[PDB]
């Protein structure tokens, strides 16, 4: 009984250590993923803007060439 209870105490202290480590690790998870989500959002916006601008650029350049 003594050995079993001592082993259980070791197991519980390991429980708290591991769970707290994983918890801090997880808040880091969340922070990093939110930052990446924001910055990909900005990149997607800029992608759409560039696509539209370059499409109208080709359109007007081809129209100008046709004018020649």
């Amino acid at each position: 009984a003594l050995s079993e209870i001592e082993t259980r105490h070791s197991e519980i202290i390991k429980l708290e250590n591991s769970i707290r480590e994983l918890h801090d690790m997880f808040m880091d998870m969340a922070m990093l993923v939110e930052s990446q989500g924001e910055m990909i959002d900005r990149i997607e916006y800029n992608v759409e803007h560039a696509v539209d601008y370059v499409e109208r650029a080709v359109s007007d350049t081809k129209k100008a060439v046709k004018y020649q």
């Binding site: 209870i5 105490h9 519980i12 429980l15 708290e16 769970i19 707290r20 994983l22 918890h23 997880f26 808040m27 998870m29 969340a30 993923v33 939110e34 990446q36 989500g37 990909i40 959002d41 990149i43 997607e44 992608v47 759409e48 560039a50 696509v51 370059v54 499409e55 080709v58 350049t61 081809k62 060439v65």
Partner: protein, 67 residues
Amino acid sequence: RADQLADESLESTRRMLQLVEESKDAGIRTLVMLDEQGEQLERIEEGMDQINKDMKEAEKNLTDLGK
């Protein structure tokens, strides 16, 4: 002092329950944002492909016309 150890074990059990529940709650929303990021990512990929194809064809046609 085994009864004190049992009481401490109960308190630690409650603490573990709270911590695990908080971790699960945050994990659910972590799932939701990963889904959102993938959703946006597919659209940006498709837009990149479209712009690349339009640009290749446009520049090639202009270069051919230049000759």
